[PDB]
């Protein structure tokens, strides 16, 4: 909308985000690979609501459902060109919930689905229909640079 | 070749004289065929006899134990009746620096915000789970000296070190140690983690220093400028609203402009200005106040100006 701001993100299990075959995955990065960490560029819609993206907001995260298969995906769309008034753009918006020192993101377009990482390292970042299960990690540390 | 072929950017550095495991870095959508490892050249397969040091087992490459001379490229192929992908990985094996229980090149950086309780995770221990699905008992150290896990200041739970009340004094390079029993023999495992403490920064919300819910005596048919002065991040949203509506460009009498100035001392407290240029005062303008809104992820802020006729 107006401007964007870079954020650092890593789940409670210290995993960070990076690209593997143009697919966002979570894992542990060592000294040399530290430069591969992806920061999250955000544009605030309203308080507790925002658009998430990477690479200077050139690509944005979104939730799409193929029939019944709800999945997360990166799209080549500039974060600033997104509007809360355009129906389609809802897929790039997430609702920020805060639990003490941690944060959680719910898909605006896919209610009930939260952003999550797996317990096993180097797995793609996905969406979970069951945050209660605890099998997937839904809590992150979202801090602005 | 009838195989996709891909190269991994991530180069995992491990310690020498210790057991190590490397899985084939494939996304879930690439787990249809059997994995097969190869050494420096894509034609020479890695040993399958568990008795040899570098051998493949359970589709993973095992270095029992790993030695510096093993640093190099390896390949894992996922083949199927109608599919084949070959990933070129890069493995590097270092040795602990002089009189140090670790080597900087193997450091995983882990951070936590101060004041609260947090946890550090000993990376890649998942491969070393006993048949009963339990990770080996880890012993933590801080800067090569033993760490007392008294369940009051530090608690070792599974593969993580719970730290109570994070503070600057907890900064240092921690090392998690374990012992895995492979084919009768027993080998050591260590991961070096650099713990960094983050100062909990305040979630600043936009502050409107002007207007301040005031009134302004204006004459009919005149021209005025209503300036909104907000303090906050340059990324904050500041805008005008009249009668719960926003100023549209198609308004031949109401035009607004935006301009911000970065604070050379503190970027968190910069000024964002939104000037509303009223070409000419119309009767309707005295009917409702002009409200300036400033907002971000944290919260919103509002202040207005109520135009009135001069007495
Ligand atoms: C960990 O060790 C490296 C060098 O091996 C050093 O530069 C770094 O400052 C240490 N980390 C901390 C938190 O002291
Ligand atoms: C905004 O910042 C302060 C408000 O008191 C002042 O120094 C400055 O002149 C103000 N400018 C405008 C255009 O309001
Ligand atoms: C805007 O103000 C006018 C009168 O000035 C009023 O009739 C109209 O209903 C207001 N708009 C809304 C959405 O209430
Ligand atoms: C100005 O009025 C608005 C409501 O119209 C209120 O939210 C805001 O807090 C007021 N400002 C002050 C300084 O009281």
CATH class value of chain A: Mainly Beta
Radius of gyration of chain B: 32 Å
By DSSP (H or I, 4+ residues per run), the number of helices of chain B equals: 0
**Overall 3D geometry of chain B?**
elongated
Q: Measure the end-to-end span of chain A.
A: 20 Å
SS strand fraction of chain B? over 45%
Order of helices and strands of chain B: EEEEEEEEEEEEEEEEEEEEEEEEE
CATH architecture of the largest domain in chain B: Sandwich
Largest sheet descriptor of chain B: 5 strands, mixed
Q: Helical amount among residues of chain B, as a percent range?
A: under 10%
Number of helices of chain A: 0
CATH superfamily of the largest domain in chain B: Immunoglobulins
Largest sheet of chain A: 8 strands, antiparallel
Counting helices, strands and paired strands, the structural category of chain B is mainly beta
How many runs of DSSP E, i.e. beta strands of chain A? 13
Question: What is the CATH topology assignment of the largest domain in chain B?
Answer: Immunoglobulin-like
Number of separate domains of chain A: 1
List the helices and strands and how they pair.
The complex is a heterodimer of chains A (145) and B (311).
Chain A: E1 5-8, E2 16-19, E3 24-27, E4 40-46, E5 49-54, E6 59-66, E7 69-75, E8 93-99, E9 102-107, E10 114-116, E11 123-124, E12 126-128, E13 143-144
Chain B: E1 6-7, E2 12-15, E3 20-22, E4 34-38, E5 54-57, E6 60-63, E7 72-80, E8 83-94, E9 108-113, E10 118-121, E11 139-142, E12 145-146, E13 154-157, E14 160-163, E15 172-182, E16 185-198, E17 207-210, E18 214-217, E19 224-232, E20 237-242, E21 245-246, E22 254-261, E23 270-278, E24 290-295, E25 300-308
Parallel strand pairs in B: 1-8, 2-8, 9-16, 18-25
Antiparallel strand pairs in B: 3-6, 4-7, 5-6, 7-8, 10-14, 11-12, 11-15, 13-14, 15-16, 17-19, 19-23, 20-21, 20-24, 22-23, 24-25
